[PDB]
Amino acid sequence: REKERQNRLAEERARREEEENRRKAEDEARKK
Question: Taking phi first (over 0 means left), then psi (-120 to 50 degrees means alpha), and beta for anything else, what does residue 17 get?
């Protein structure tokens, strides 16, 4: 159960991270 929880939270973190990455990408694109 602990590893399930930790992995779920970890994928949530990584998904938020890729959200911010694509976000900064589209920001730079607007700068272009």
Answer: alpha
